[PDB]
Amino acid sequence: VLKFTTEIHPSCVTRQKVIGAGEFGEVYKGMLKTKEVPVAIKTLKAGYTEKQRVDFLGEAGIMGQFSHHNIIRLEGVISKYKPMMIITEYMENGALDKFLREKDGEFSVLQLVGMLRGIAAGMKYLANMNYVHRDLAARNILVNSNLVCKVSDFGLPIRWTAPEAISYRKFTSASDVWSFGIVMWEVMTYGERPYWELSNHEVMKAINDGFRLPTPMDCPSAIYQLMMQCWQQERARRPKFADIVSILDKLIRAPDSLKTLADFDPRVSIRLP
Ligand SMILES: Cc1ccc(C(=O)Nc2cccc(C(F)(F)F)c2)cc1Nc1nc(N2CCOCC2)nc(-n2ccnc2)n1
Numbered sequence: 001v002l003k004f005t006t007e008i009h010p011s012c013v014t015r016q017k018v019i020g021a022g023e024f025g026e027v028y029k030g031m032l033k034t035k036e037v038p039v040a041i042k043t044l045k046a047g048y049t050e051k052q053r054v055d056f057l058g059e060a061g062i063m064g065q066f067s068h069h070n071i072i073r074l075e076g077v078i079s080k081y082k083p084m085m086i087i088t089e090y091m092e093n094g095a096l097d098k099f100l101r102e103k104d105g106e107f108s109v110l111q112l113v114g115m116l117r118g119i120a121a122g123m124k125y126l127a128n129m130n131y132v133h134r135d136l137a138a139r140n141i142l143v144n145s146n147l148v149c150k151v152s153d154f155g156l157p158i159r160w161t162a163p164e165a166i167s168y169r170k171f172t173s174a175s176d177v178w179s180f181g182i183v184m185w186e187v188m189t190y191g192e193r194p195y196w197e198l199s200n201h202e203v204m205k206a207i208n209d210g211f212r213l214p215t216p217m218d219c220p221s222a223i224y225q226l227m228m229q230c231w232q233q234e235r236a237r238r239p240k241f242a243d244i245v246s247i248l249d250k251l252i253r254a255p256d257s258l259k260t261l262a263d264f265d266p267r268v269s270i271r272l273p
Contacts (some may be wrong), residue, residue, distance in 0.1 A: 001057050005064035006076035008032070008087060013078065015041055020154065023055065024048040025083060029090060032075055038090040039075055043083040053084075060086045062131065070122030072142060072152040089150075096149060097138035101191035109220060109258050112187050115149050116223075117248040122151040123180060124241035127173035134171045136160065136179035138186040158200040159193075163207060164235055174235045180244065181230025188216040188223060207233075215262040222251055224262040 012033045020027035025043035032039040044056045063074040063086070078085040093099050096115075119141060126133060133140075135153055137160045142150040162178035164170040182194055194213060195203045212231050215224045226247055232238050239247075251257050 001061035002064065002077060002079060003061070004067075005060050005074060007080060008076035008078050008085070010078055010081045010085075013039075013041065013085065013087065022155065024052045030087075032087060037075070038092075040088045040090050042086040042088075044085075045083050056084065056086070063088070066125070066129070066131075068122055068125045069148065070118045070150060071125060072150045088152075091142045091144050091150070093143040093145060095139055095154075096141040096143050097186065097191050099143050099191075100138070100187065104190045109218070110252065110255055111147060113220070113223065113248060113252060113258060115143075115147060116184055116187055117245065117252060118149045119151060119183060120180065120241060120244045120248055122149070123173075123176060124245050126151065127176065127241050132171050132173055133176050133179070134165075136176050136183060138183055138191065141183070159195055159203055162235070163204075163233060166204065170235075172235070173241065174238050177230050177238045177241065177244070180241075181227040182213075184223065184227040184230070185213050185216060188219045192216075214265055217264050219262050219264075220251070220258040221260045221262045222247075222257055 013030060015028040015030040017029050018026045019029050019040065022042045022044070024047070025045040028041045028043070030039050030041045031037065044052065048056070057077075057079060060074065060077040060079075063072070064077070066072075066074075073089045075087040075089060077087065123133070123136065133151070133153065135157060136151070137157060140152050140154055142152050144150065158166060160179045160182045162175035165175040165178075185194060186192065195206070198206065210233075212228060226239075226244065229237075229239050230244075
């Protein structure tokens with residue numbers, strides 16, 4: 001299980017502040033020696049069950065297998081001592097959802113599209129590795145100080161989930177593509193809530209009736225077209241992540257393609273002379 005993971009000795013780890021919770025233990029911000037490097041640390045505390053131990057070390061195992069620029073990096077694991085720990089890199093900019101809501105309007109279209117290309121490349125890698133994420137959303141993406149997005153999974157999302165996954169529990173890389181389209185909309189809106197104040201039942205009814213999120217403000221036509229393709233009801237009609245990466249790469253490498261904007265439908269019109 002731990003074959004792509006490095007065992008870290010507990011004397012090299014300092015926990016500082018609680019930043020969240022695991023299934024059976026806290027997540028902390030801390031420091032790792034090997035000068036000191038900031039890390040996030042998920043613990044498994046005394047009394048955990050067999051199933052919790054299997055899921056915890058299984059999680060570390062899969063994270064260790066991933067080696068990609070756009071996937072969170074595992075620094076290592078403590079499995080030989082208690083409490084057990086999963087240790088990852090740390091990003092001062094934090095999670096993408098809060099980041100964009102706190103930086104409204106501060107980036108260029110090219111910067112936003114570049115973020116999406118990195119997320120798509122991480123997802124293409126996961127899908128190729130036969131890993132279905134199931135919870136792709138901006139809240140599960142970390143942003144580094146180069147604006148590079150790292151797909152993560154912080155644990156627990158009707159508004160991000162494809163219809164077949166909601167209806168009959170069919171989670172695949174194609175349901176992850178639906179979620180990616182929602183993430184595109186989150187990025188281009190600077191972290192707006194998908195479907196605004198609609199309830200979960202209202203969202204599913206709207207989707208089943210064929211309604212889809214409208215274009216963000218200032219959004220390239222090509223980007224809105226791409227998110228719309230991610231939201232095809234028929235799973236097989238959605239692009240694969242390889243198609244998404246290819247499209248986004250081509251738009252970035254010919255950036256004039258992003259200057260054509262989709263028409264924004266105003267809710268409110270102001271009359272002025
Ligand atoms: C410690 C830790 C453990 C596991 C994971 C994680 O991603 N596992 C995972 C599992 C399956 C698939 C994938 C996937 F996607 F790669 F495929 C990834 C991330 C963190 N690391 C971490 N956890 C948080 N949390 C936020 C608060 O709630 C608790 C968690 N915050 C930060 N953090 C904040 C600022 N800089 C870093 N790091």
